[PDB]
Amino acid sequence: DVVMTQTPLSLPVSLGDQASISCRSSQSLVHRNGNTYLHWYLQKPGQSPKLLIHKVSNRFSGVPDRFSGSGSGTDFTLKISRVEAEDLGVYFCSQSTHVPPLTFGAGTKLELKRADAAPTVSIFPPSSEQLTSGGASVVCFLNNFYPKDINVKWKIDGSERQNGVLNSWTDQDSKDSTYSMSSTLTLTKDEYERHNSYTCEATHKTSTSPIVKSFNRNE
Amino acid sequence: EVQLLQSGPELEKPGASVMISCKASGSSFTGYNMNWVRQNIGKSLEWIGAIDPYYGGTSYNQKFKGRATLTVDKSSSTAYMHLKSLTSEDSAVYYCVSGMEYWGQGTSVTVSSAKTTAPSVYPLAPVCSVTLGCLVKGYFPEPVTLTWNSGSLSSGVHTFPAVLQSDLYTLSSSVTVTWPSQSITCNVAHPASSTKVDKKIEPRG
Numbered sequence A: 001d002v003v004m005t006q007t008p009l010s011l012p013v014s015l016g017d018q019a020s021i022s023c024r025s026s027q028s029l030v031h032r033n034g035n036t037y038l039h040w041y042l043q044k045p046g047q048s049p050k051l052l053i054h055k056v057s058n059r060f061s062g063v064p065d066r067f068s069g070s071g072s073g074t075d076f077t078l079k080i081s082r083v084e085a086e087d088l089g090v091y092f093c094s095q096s097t098h099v100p101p102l103t104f105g106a107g108t109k110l111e112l113k114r115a116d117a118a119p120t121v122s123i124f125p126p127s128s129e130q131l132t133s134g135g136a137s138v139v140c141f142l143n144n145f146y147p148k149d150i151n152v153k154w155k156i157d158g159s160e161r162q163n164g165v166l167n168s169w170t171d172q173d174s175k176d177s178t179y180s181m182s183s184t185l186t187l188t189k190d191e192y193e194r195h196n197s198y199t200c201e202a203t204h205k206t207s208t209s210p211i212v213k214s215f216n217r218n219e
Numbered sequence B: 001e002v003q004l005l006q007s008g009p010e011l012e013k014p015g016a017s018v019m020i021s022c023k024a025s026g027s028s029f030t031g032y033n034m035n036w037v038r039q040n041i042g043k044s045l046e047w048i049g050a051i052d053p054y055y056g057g058t059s060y061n062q063k064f065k066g067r068a069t070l071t072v073d074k075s076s077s078t079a080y081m082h083l084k085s086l087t088s089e090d091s092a093v094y095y096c097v098s099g100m101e102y103w104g105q106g107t108s109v110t111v112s113s114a115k116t117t118a119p120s121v122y123p124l125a126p127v128c129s130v131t132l133g134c135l136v137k138g139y140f141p142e143p144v145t146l147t148w149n150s151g152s153l154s155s156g157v158h159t160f161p162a163v164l165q166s167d168l169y170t171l172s173s174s175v176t177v178t179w180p181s182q183s184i185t186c187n188v189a190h191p192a193s194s195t196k197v198d199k200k201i202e203p204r205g
Ligand SMILES: CC(=O)N[C@H]1[C@H](O[C@@H]2[C@H](O[C@]3(C(=O)O)C[C@H](O)[C@@H](NC(C)=O)[C@H]([C@H](O)[C@@H](CO)O[C@]4(C(=O)O)C[C@H](O)[C@@H](NC(C)=O)[C@H]([C@H](O)[C@H](O)CO)O4)O3)[C@@H](O)[C@H](O[C@H]3[C@H](O)[C@@H](O)[C@H](O)O[C@@H]3CO)O[C@@H]2CO)O[C@H](CO)[C@H](O)[C@@H]1O
Pocket: A031, A033, A037, A039, A054, A055, A096, A097, A098, A099, A100, A102, B030, B031, B032, B033, B034, B035, B050, B052, B053, B054, B055, B057, B098, B099, B100, B101
Protein backbone atom coordinates (compact mmCIF):
# COMPACT_ATOMS: atom_id res chain seq x y z
CA ASP A 1 0.00 0.00 0.00
CA VAL A 2 0.81 3.67 -0.44
CA VAL A 3 0.35 4.44 3.22
CA MET A 4 -1.75 7.47 4.11
CA THR A 5 -0.99 8.95 7.52
CA GLN A 6 -3.71 11.13 8.86
CA THR A 7 -3.42 13.34 11.87
CA PRO A 8 -4.87 13.97 14.31
CA LEU A 9 -6.80 10.84 14.83
CA SER A 10 -9.15 12.63 17.21
CA LEU A 11 -10.10 16.29 16.94
CA PRO A 12 -12.33 17.75 19.61
CA VAL A 13 -13.66 21.14 18.69
CA SER A 14 -16.36 23.59 19.61
CA LEU A 15 -19.08 24.40 17.12
CA GLY A 16 -17.94 27.46 15.23
CA ASP A 17 -14.21 26.74 15.61
CA GLN A 18 -12.17 26.06 12.51
CA ALA A 19 -10.61 22.67 11.92
CA SER A 20 -7.52 21.47 10.11
CA ILE A 21 -6.85 17.81 9.22
CA SER A 22 -3.61 16.63 7.69
CA CYS A 23 -2.84 13.71 5.47
CA ARG A 24 0.62 12.59 4.29
CA SER A 25 1.31 9.90 1.70
CA SER A 26 4.36 7.59 1.67
CA GLN A 27 5.18 8.69 -1.90
CA SER A 28 4.07 11.44 -4.26
CA LEU A 29 0.52 11.34 -5.44
CA VAL A 30 1.24 13.11 -8.67
CA HIS A 31 0.02 10.93 -11.54
CA ARG A 32 1.73 10.67 -14.90
CA ASN A 33 -1.42 12.43 -16.30
CA GLY A 34 -0.76 15.54 -14.19
CA ASN A 35 -3.67 15.07 -11.74
CA THR A 36 -3.16 14.38 -8.07
CA TYR A 37 -5.68 11.76 -6.85
CA LEU A 38 -6.11 12.76 -3.17
CA HIS A 39 -9.69 12.80 -1.96
CA TRP A 40 -11.50 13.47 1.29
CA TYR A 41 -14.62 11.67 2.53
CA LEU A 42 -16.86 12.31 5.54
CA GLN A 43 -18.74 9.51 7.33
CA LYS A 44 -21.51 10.69 9.59
CA PRO A 45 -22.40 8.35 12.36
CA GLY A 46 -24.38 5.38 11.06
CA GLN A 47 -24.20 6.34 7.38
CA SER A 48 -22.17 5.59 4.25
CA PRO A 49 -19.16 7.81 3.56
CA LYS A 50 -19.79 10.69 1.22
CA LEU A 51 -17.26 12.51 -1.02
CA LEU A 52 -16.41 16.05 0.01
CA ILE A 53 -13.24 16.92 -1.98
CA HIS A 54 -11.71 15.17 -5.01
CA LYS A 55 -8.32 15.66 -6.67
CA VAL A 56 -6.90 17.73 -3.77
CA SER A 57 -9.21 20.71 -3.94
CA ASN A 58 -12.29 20.12 -6.06
CA ARG A 59 -15.50 20.51 -4.17
CA PHE A 60 -18.00 17.79 -4.96
CA SER A 61 -21.63 18.57 -5.75
CA GLY A 62 -23.45 20.07 -2.77
CA VAL A 63 -20.38 20.43 -0.54
CA PRO A 64 -20.37 23.82 1.14
CA ASP A 65 -17.67 26.41 0.76
CA ARG A 66 -16.40 26.05 4.36
CA PHE A 67 -14.64 22.84 3.28
CA SER A 68 -11.43 23.40 1.29
CA GLY A 69 -8.58 21.10 0.49
CA SER A 70 -5.03 21.83 -0.49
CA GLY A 71 -1.58 20.40 -0.77
CA SER A 72 0.70 18.69 -3.16
CA GLY A 73 3.02 15.79 -3.60
CA THR A 74 2.91 14.02 -0.31
CA ASP A 75 1.41 16.66 2.02
CA PHE A 76 -2.33 17.54 2.13
CA THR A 77 -4.67 19.49 4.32
CA LEU A 78 -8.44 19.65 4.75
CA LYS A 79 -9.70 22.89 6.26
CA ILE A 80 -13.10 23.55 7.69
CA SER A 81 -13.46 27.28 8.21
CA ARG A 82 -16.39 27.06 10.66
CA VAL A 83 -17.47 23.67 12.05
CA GLU A 84 -21.22 23.01 12.07
CA ALA A 85 -23.01 20.06 13.75
CA GLU A 86 -23.62 18.35 10.43
CA ASP A 87 -19.82 18.31 10.01
CA LEU A 88 -19.26 16.04 13.00
CA GLY A 89 -18.13 12.53 12.01
CA VAL A 90 -15.08 10.77 10.73
CA TYR A 91 -13.01 12.24 7.86
CA PHE A 92 -10.88 9.99 5.67
CA CYS A 93 -8.32 10.91 3.10
CA SER A 94 -7.69 8.54 0.28
CA GLN A 95 -5.35 8.21 -2.69
CA SER A 96 -6.20 6.78 -6.02
CA THR A 97 -3.05 7.61 -7.99
CA HIS A 98 -1.47 4.23 -7.23
CA VAL A 99 -4.11 1.63 -7.97
CA PRO A 100 -4.11 -1.26 -7.03
CA PRO A 101 -4.51 -0.86 -4.17
CA LEU A 102 -6.50 2.30 -3.58
CA THR A 103 -5.77 3.29 0.05
CA PHE A 104 -7.29 5.31 2.91
CA GLY A 105 -6.09 7.12 5.95
CA ALA A 106 -7.13 5.81 9.33
CA GLY A 107 -9.69 8.59 9.86
CA THR A 108 -9.92 11.64 12.01
CA LYS A 109 -12.95 11.84 14.32
CA LEU A 110 -14.22 15.39 14.55
CA GLU A 111 -15.84 15.40 18.00
CA LEU A 112 -17.58 18.03 20.12
CA LYS A 113 -15.80 19.42 23.14
CA ARG A 114 -17.63 19.69 26.43
CA ALA A 115 -16.79 20.02 30.14
CA ASP A 116 -15.34 17.03 32.00
CA ALA A 117 -18.02 14.67 33.35
CA ALA A 118 -17.38 11.76 35.71
CA PRO A 119 -18.95 8.43 34.79
CA THR A 120 -21.99 7.29 36.61
CA VAL A 121 -21.07 3.63 37.37
CA SER A 122 -23.62 0.92 38.14
CA ILE A 123 -22.96 -2.77 38.75
CA PHE A 124 -25.52 -5.63 38.44
CA PRO A 125 -25.16 -9.10 39.71
CA PRO A 126 -26.57 -12.05 37.62
CA SER A 127 -30.34 -12.20 37.40
CA SER A 128 -31.95 -15.14 39.19
CA GLU A 129 -33.43 -16.05 35.80
CA GLN A 130 -29.99 -16.48 34.27
CA LEU A 131 -28.55 -18.41 37.19
CA THR A 132 -31.43 -20.96 37.00
CA SER A 133 -30.04 -21.73 33.58
CA GLY A 134 -26.42 -22.31 34.64
CA GLY A 135 -24.99 -18.94 33.49
CA ALA A 136 -23.77 -15.87 35.34
CA SER A 137 -23.24 -12.44 33.75
CA VAL A 138 -22.17 -9.45 35.77
CA VAL A 139 -22.86 -6.10 34.07
CA CYS A 140 -21.34 -2.78 34.62
CA PHE A 141 -22.47 0.50 33.09
CA LEU A 142 -20.20 3.53 33.01
CA ASN A 143 -22.44 6.30 31.68
CA ASN A 144 -22.27 9.93 30.58
CA PHE A 145 -18.56 10.58 30.92
CA TYR A 146 -16.17 12.98 29.20
CA PRO A 147 -13.44 12.89 27.99
CA LYS A 148 -13.57 9.56 26.20
CA ASP A 149 -10.41 7.97 27.55
CA ILE A 150 -11.29 5.55 30.34
CA ASN A 151 -9.83 2.30 31.71
CA VAL A 152 -12.13 -0.48 32.92
CA LYS A 153 -11.30 -3.65 34.76
CA TRP A 154 -13.05 -6.45 36.47
CA LYS A 155 -11.70 -7.67 39.72
CA ILE A 156 -12.86 -10.79 41.47
CA ASP A 157 -11.74 -11.14 45.13
CA GLY A 158 -9.00 -8.70 44.23
CA SER A 159 -7.64 -10.34 41.09
CA GLU A 160 -8.06 -8.96 37.64
CA ARG A 161 -10.39 -10.95 35.47
CA GLN A 162 -9.89 -10.58 31.73
CA ASN A 163 -11.39 -13.77 30.39
CA GLY A 164 -15.12 -13.61 29.53
CA VAL A 165 -15.38 -9.83 29.27
CA LEU A 166 -17.42 -8.06 26.46
CA ASN A 167 -17.37 -4.32 26.15
CA SER A 168 -19.49 -1.98 24.10
CA TRP A 169 -19.60 1.78 23.80
CA THR A 170 -21.96 4.35 22.37
CA ASP A 171 -20.85 7.08 19.98
CA GLN A 172 -20.64 10.51 21.40
CA ASP A 173 -24.17 11.55 22.41
CA SER A 174 -25.72 14.06 19.99
CA LYS A 175 -27.58 15.77 22.85
CA ASP A 176 -25.06 15.96 25.73
CA SER A 177 -21.71 15.11 23.98
CA THR A 178 -20.84 12.48 26.59
CA TYR A 179 -19.78 8.83 26.13
CA SER A 180 -21.17 5.72 27.75
CA MET A 181 -19.83 2.18 28.06
CA SER A 182 -21.06 -1.25 29.07
CA SER A 183 -18.87 -4.11 30.33
CA THR A 184 -20.24 -7.61 30.75
CA LEU A 185 -18.41 -10.42 32.52
CA THR A 186 -19.85 -13.90 31.80
CA LEU A 187 -19.06 -16.88 33.99
CA THR A 188 -20.65 -20.26 34.60
CA LYS A 189 -22.95 -20.40 37.64
CA ASP A 190 -20.48 -22.82 39.35
CA GLU A 191 -17.55 -20.40 38.86
CA TYR A 192 -19.65 -17.43 39.93
CA GLU A 193 -20.45 -19.30 43.18
CA ARG A 194 -16.78 -19.76 44.02
CA HIS A 195 -15.99 -16.12 44.47
CA ASN A 196 -17.39 -13.58 46.86
CA SER A 197 -16.47 -10.02 45.69
CA TYR A 198 -17.09 -8.68 42.15
CA THR A 199 -15.81 -5.19 41.25
CA CYS A 200 -16.13 -2.92 38.22
CA GLU A 201 -13.10 -0.61 38.47
CA ALA A 202 -12.50 2.42 36.29
CA THR A 203 -9.91 5.10 36.00
CA HIS A 204 -10.80 8.44 34.39
CA LYS A 205 -9.46 12.03 34.31
CA THR A 206 -12.26 13.15 36.69
CA SER A 207 -10.84 11.27 39.70
CA THR A 208 -7.37 10.67 41.00
CA SER A 209 -8.69 7.60 42.77
CA PRO A 210 -10.22 4.71 40.98
CA ILE A 211 -13.93 4.72 40.50
CA VAL A 212 -15.19 1.45 42.09
CA LYS A 213 -18.52 -0.33 42.20
CA SER A 214 -18.65 -3.74 43.86
CA PHE A 215 -20.93 -6.29 45.42
CA ASN A 216 -20.49 -9.48 47.37
CA ARG A 217 -22.35 -12.53 46.03
CA ASN A 218 -24.13 -13.25 49.31
CA GLU A 219 -25.97 -9.81 49.36
CA GLU B 1 -29.45 11.69 -8.86
CA VAL B 2 -26.92 8.83 -8.85
CA GLN B 3 -28.05 5.99 -6.71
CA LEU B 4 -26.38 2.74 -5.84
CA LEU B 5 -28.75 0.10 -4.40
CA GLN B 6 -26.96 -2.76 -2.73
CA SER B 7 -28.34 -6.15 -1.79
CA GLY B 8 -29.36 -7.11 1.70
CA PRO B 9 -27.47 -8.47 4.66
CA GLU B 10 -25.52 -11.75 4.40
CA LEU B 11 -25.09 -14.41 7.08
CA GLU B 12 -22.62 -17.12 6.28
CA LYS B 13 -20.60 -19.89 7.88
CA PRO B 14 -16.81 -19.92 7.80
CA GLY B 15 -15.60 -21.19 4.43
CA ALA B 16 -18.78 -20.18 2.67
CA SER B 17 -19.04 -17.42 0.04
CA VAL B 18 -21.16 -14.32 -0.61
CA MET B 19 -22.30 -12.61 -3.79
CA ILE B 20 -23.30 -8.97 -3.22
CA SER B 21 -25.00 -6.83 -5.87
CA CYS B 22 -25.00 -3.14 -6.61
CA LYS B 23 -27.70 -1.72 -8.91
CA ALA B 24 -26.70 1.64 -10.25
CA SER B 25 -29.08 4.21 -11.60
CA GLY B 26 -28.78 7.80 -12.81
CA SER B 27 -25.21 8.04 -14.17
CA SER B 28 -23.27 6.27 -16.83
CA PHE B 29 -22.77 2.70 -15.61
CA THR B 30 -19.97 2.01 -18.14
CA GLY B 31 -18.51 5.54 -17.68
CA TYR B 32 -16.90 5.02 -14.28
CA ASN B 33 -15.16 2.15 -12.63
CA MET B 34 -17.11 0.45 -9.90
CA ASN B 35 -15.01 0.15 -6.84
CA TRP B 36 -15.62 -2.03 -3.79
CA VAL B 37 -14.54 -1.08 -0.22
CA ARG B 38 -15.28 -2.68 3.16
CA GLN B 39 -15.45 -1.14 6.60
CA ASN B 40 -14.12 -3.44 9.21
CA ILE B 41 -15.49 -3.87 12.72
CA GLY B 42 -12.56 -1.49 13.75
CA LYS B 43 -14.01 1.13 11.38
CA SER B 44 -11.03 1.26 9.00
CA LEU B 45 -11.78 1.35 5.27
CA GLU B 46 -10.20 -1.25 3.07
CA TRP B 47 -10.39 -1.26 -0.79
CA ILE B 48 -11.04 -4.58 -2.33
CA GLY B 49 -10.89 -3.81 -6.07
CA ALA B 50 -12.36 -2.06 -9.08
CA ILE B 51 -13.93 -3.13 -12.40
CA ASP B 52 -14.27 -1.18 -15.64
CA PRO B 53 -17.81 -2.21 -16.65
CA TYR B 54 -17.34 -1.46 -20.29
CA TYR B 55 -14.34 -3.86 -21.01
CA GLY B 56 -14.56 -5.85 -17.78
CA GLY B 57 -10.97 -5.19 -16.75
CA THR B 58 -10.33 -5.60 -13.01
CA SER B 59 -7.73 -4.66 -10.39
CA TYR B 60 -7.54 -6.15 -6.85
CA ASN B 61 -5.97 -5.55 -3.56
CA GLN B 62 -3.52 -8.47 -3.13
CA LYS B 63 -4.54 -8.71 0.51
CA PHE B 64 -7.55 -10.70 -0.65
CA LYS B 65 -5.39 -13.42 -2.11
CA GLY B 66 -7.68 -13.77 -5.18
CA ARG B 67 -10.76 -14.60 -3.03
CA ALA B 68 -12.71 -11.69 -4.41
CA THR B 69 -14.05 -11.58 -7.99
CA LEU B 70 -15.80 -8.56 -9.51
CA THR B 71 -18.28 -8.80 -12.35
CA VAL B 72 -20.96 -6.66 -14.03
CA ASP B 73 -24.15 -7.21 -15.95
CA LYS B 74 -24.49 -4.31 -18.26
CA SER B 75 -28.00 -5.43 -19.29
CA SER B 76 -29.22 -4.62 -15.69
CA SER B 77 -26.66 -1.91 -14.68
CA THR B 78 -25.61 -4.17 -11.84
CA ALA B 79 -22.14 -4.73 -10.43
CA TYR B 80 -21.30 -7.84 -8.36
CA MET B 81 -18.78 -8.76 -5.74
CA HIS B 82 -18.16 -12.44 -4.93
CA LEU B 83 -16.01 -13.27 -1.98
CA LYS B 84 -15.09 -16.82 -1.18
CA SER B 85 -13.58 -18.79 1.70
CA LEU B 86 -14.94 -16.50 4.36
CA THR B 87 -13.52 -16.14 7.82
CA SER B 88 -14.45 -13.91 10.73
CA GLU B 89 -11.93 -11.38 9.34
CA ASP B 90 -14.41 -10.79 6.51
CA SER B 91 -17.26 -9.73 8.77
CA ALA B 92 -17.76 -6.14 7.66
CA VAL B 93 -19.91 -3.64 5.79
CA TYR B 94 -19.23 -3.82 2.05
CA TYR B 95 -19.75 -0.83 -0.24
CA CYS B 96 -19.87 -0.31 -3.93
CA VAL B 97 -18.52 3.07 -4.95
CA SER B 98 -19.06 4.50 -8.42
CA GLY B 99 -15.91 6.28 -9.59
CA MET B 100 -14.98 6.77 -5.90
CA GLU B 101 -17.68 9.50 -5.98
CA TYR B 102 -20.96 7.88 -4.98
CA TRP B 103 -21.37 5.17 -2.31
CA GLY B 104 -24.03 2.55 -1.95
CA GLN B 105 -25.85 2.12 1.38
CA GLY B 106 -23.68 -0.84 2.41
CA THR B 107 -24.26 -4.58 2.72
CA SER B 108 -23.33 -6.19 6.01
CA VAL B 109 -21.64 -9.61 5.96
CA THR B 110 -21.50 -11.54 9.17
CA VAL B 111 -19.49 -14.76 9.44
CA SER B 112 -20.96 -17.06 12.11
CA SER B 113 -21.81 -20.75 12.45
CA ALA B 114 -25.02 -19.96 14.35
CA LYS B 115 -28.51 -20.64 13.15
CA THR B 116 -31.34 -18.26 14.13
CA THR B 117 -31.27 -18.02 17.88
CA ALA B 118 -33.66 -16.07 20.13
CA PRO B 119 -32.16 -13.83 22.83
CA SER B 120 -32.41 -14.56 26.52
CA VAL B 121 -33.58 -11.35 28.17
CA TYR B 122 -32.58 -10.75 31.80
CA PRO B 123 -33.84 -7.91 34.00
CA LEU B 124 -31.07 -6.16 35.92
CA ALA B 125 -32.25 -4.65 39.22
CA PRO B 126 -29.81 -2.69 41.38
CA VAL B 127 -27.55 -4.20 43.98
CA CYS B 128 -29.41 -4.73 47.25
CA SER B 129 -31.52 8.38 40.77
CA VAL B 130 -31.76 4.63 40.21
CA THR B 131 -30.19 2.87 37.24
CA LEU B 132 -31.74 -0.34 35.94
CA GLY B 133 -30.79 -2.58 33.13
CA CYS B 134 -31.67 -5.23 30.68
CA LEU B 135 -29.32 -7.82 29.24
CA VAL B 136 -30.12 -9.35 25.87
CA LYS B 137 -27.87 -12.32 25.42
CA GLY B 138 -27.11 -15.12 23.07
CA TYR B 139 -29.05 -14.14 19.89
CA PHE B 140 -28.49 -14.40 16.13
CA PRO B 141 -28.76 -12.46 13.80
CA GLU B 142 -29.10 -8.76 14.13
CA PRO B 143 -31.17 -6.76 14.81
CA VAL B 144 -33.14 -6.53 18.04
CA THR B 145 -35.22 -3.57 19.20
CA LEU B 146 -35.37 -2.63 22.87
CA THR B 147 -37.57 -0.11 24.58
CA TRP B 148 -38.35 0.83 28.17
CA ASN B 149 -42.09 1.07 29.22
CA SER B 150 -42.96 0.82 25.51
CA GLY B 151 -40.96 3.93 24.67
CA SER B 152 -42.34 6.07 27.48
CA LEU B 153 -38.84 6.12 29.11
CA SER B 154 -36.58 7.48 26.39
CA SER B 155 -34.49 10.09 28.19
CA GLY B 156 -31.82 8.56 30.44
CA VAL B 157 -31.59 5.41 28.29
CA HIS B 158 -28.37 3.93 26.92
CA THR B 159 -28.72 1.03 24.60
CA PHE B 160 -25.38 -0.33 23.51
CA PRO B 161 -24.33 -1.73 20.11
CA ALA B 162 -24.44 -5.42 20.00
CA VAL B 163 -21.23 -7.35 20.05
CA LEU B 164 -20.64 -10.73 18.38
CA GLN B 165 -18.74 -13.30 20.45
CA SER B 166 -18.58 -17.10 19.96
CA ASP B 167 -21.09 -16.76 17.13
CA LEU B 168 -23.83 -15.01 19.07
CA TYR B 169 -24.71 -11.44 19.95
CA THR B 170 -25.09 -9.72 23.27
CA LEU B 171 -26.54 -6.27 23.83
CA SER B 172 -27.40 -4.35 27.01
CA SER B 173 -29.34 -1.29 27.93
CA SER B 174 -29.55 0.91 30.97
CA VAL B 175 -32.32 3.27 32.08
CA THR B 176 -31.71 5.94 34.76
CA VAL B 177 -34.72 7.40 36.73
CA THR B 178 -39.81 6.62 40.93
CA TRP B 179 -39.01 2.92 41.10
CA PRO B 180 -39.94 0.43 42.34
CA SER B 181 -43.28 2.15 43.04
CA GLN B 182 -44.00 2.67 39.31
CA SER B 183 -43.48 -0.34 37.02
CA ILE B 184 -40.39 -0.45 34.69
CA THR B 185 -40.29 -3.01 31.94
CA CYS B 186 -37.86 -3.64 29.18
CA ASN B 187 -39.49 -4.63 25.88
CA VAL B 188 -37.36 -6.68 23.54
CA ALA B 189 -38.04 -7.84 19.99
CA HIS B 190 -36.04 -10.13 17.77
CA PRO B 191 -37.88 -10.33 14.44
CA ALA B 192 -35.83 -13.18 13.08
CA SER B 193 -36.85 -15.56 15.80
CA SER B 194 -40.39 -14.00 16.18
CA THR B 195 -39.50 -13.26 19.77
CA LYS B 196 -41.27 -10.50 21.59
CA VAL B 197 -40.69 -10.39 25.32
CA ASP B 198 -41.33 -8.05 28.19
CA LYS B 199 -39.22 -8.17 31.39
CA LYS B 200 -40.35 -6.29 34.46
CA ILE B 201 -37.49 -5.10 36.65
CA GLU B 202 -38.28 -6.41 40.17
CA PRO B 203 -36.28 -5.50 43.23
CA ARG B 204 -33.95 -8.39 44.20
CA GLY B 205 -35.12 -10.48 47.20
C1 LIG C 1 -3.68 0.77 -15.78
C2 LIG C 1 -3.50 2.13 -15.14
O1 LIG C 1 -2.63 2.95 -15.51
N1 LIG C 1 -4.40 2.40 -14.18
C3 LIG C 1 -4.52 3.70 -13.60
C4 LIG C 1 -5.65 4.48 -14.20
O2 LIG C 1 -5.33 4.85 -15.54
C5 LIG C 1 -6.39 5.29 -16.40
C6 LIG C 1 -6.74 4.13 -17.31
O3 LIG C 1 -7.04 2.90 -16.58
C7 LIG C 1 -8.42 2.58 -16.52
C8 LIG C 1 -8.47 1.42 -15.60
O4 LIG C 1 -8.97 1.44 -14.44
O5 LIG C 1 -7.91 0.30 -15.99
C9 LIG C 1 -9.03 2.28 -17.93
C10 LIG C 1 -10.50 1.99 -17.79
O6 LIG C 1 -11.00 1.60 -19.09
C11 LIG C 1 -11.13 3.26 -17.25
N2 LIG C 1 -12.56 3.03 -16.96
C12 LIG C 1 -13.60 3.64 -17.51
C13 LIG C 1 -13.31 4.50 -18.61
O7 LIG C 1 -14.83 3.47 -17.12
C14 LIG C 1 -10.46 3.67 -15.90
C15 LIG C 1 -10.88 5.07 -15.48
O8 LIG C 1 -10.18 6.12 -16.18
C16 LIG C 1 -10.75 5.38 -13.98
C17 LIG C 1 -9.35 5.17 -13.38
O9 LIG C 1 -9.06 3.81 -13.05
O10 LIG C 1 -11.11 6.76 -13.86
C18 LIG C 1 -11.90 7.13 -12.67
C19 LIG C 1 -13.15 6.22 -12.65
O11 LIG C 1 -13.97 6.46 -13.64
O12 LIG C 1 -13.41 5.31 -11.83
C20 LIG C 1 -12.13 8.63 -12.76
C21 LIG C 1 -12.66 9.24 -11.43
O13 LIG C 1 -12.66 10.66 -11.55
C22 LIG C 1 -11.69 8.85 -10.34
N3 LIG C 1 -12.18 9.30 -9.09
C23 LIG C 1 -11.72 10.34 -8.40
C24 LIG C 1 -12.53 10.71 -7.19
O14 LIG C 1 -10.74 11.01 -8.79
C25 LIG C 1 -11.63 7.33 -10.33
C26 LIG C 1 -10.80 6.64 -9.22
O15 LIG C 1 -9.47 7.17 -9.12
C27 LIG C 1 -10.76 5.10 -9.45
O16 LIG C 1 -12.14 4.64 -9.58
C28 LIG C 1 -10.07 4.39 -8.36
O17 LIG C 1 -10.00 2.98 -8.46
O18 LIG C 1 -11.11 6.80 -11.57
O19 LIG C 1 -9.02 3.73 -16.00
C29 LIG C 1 -5.52 3.82 -18.21
O20 LIG C 1 -5.90 2.85 -19.19
C30 LIG C 1 -5.08 5.10 -18.93
O21 LIG C 1 -3.80 4.97 -19.61
C31 LIG C 1 -3.86 5.00 -21.03
C32 LIG C 1 -3.41 6.37 -21.46
O22 LIG C 1 -4.28 7.36 -20.91
C33 LIG C 1 -3.36 6.44 -22.99
O23 LIG C 1 -2.85 7.71 -23.29
C34 LIG C 1 -2.47 5.31 -23.53
O24 LIG C 1 -2.44 5.14 -24.96
O25 LIG C 1 -2.99 4.04 -23.07
C35 LIG C 1 -2.93 3.91 -21.61
C36 LIG C 1 -3.35 2.49 -21.28
O26 LIG C 1 -4.72 2.29 -21.60
O27 LIG C 1 -4.81 6.12 -17.97
C37 LIG C 1 -5.99 6.48 -17.18
C38 LIG C 1 -5.53 7.62 -16.29
O28 LIG C 1 -5.24 8.80 -17.06
O29 LIG C 1 -5.79 5.74 -13.53
C39 LIG C 1 -6.19 5.59 -12.17
C40 LIG C 1 -6.56 6.91 -11.60
O30 LIG C 1 -7.34 6.68 -10.39
C41 LIG C 1 -5.03 4.93 -11.44
O31 LIG C 1 -3.89 5.84 -11.50
C42 LIG C 1 -4.72 3.56 -12.07
O32 LIG C 1 -3.53 3.06 -11.45
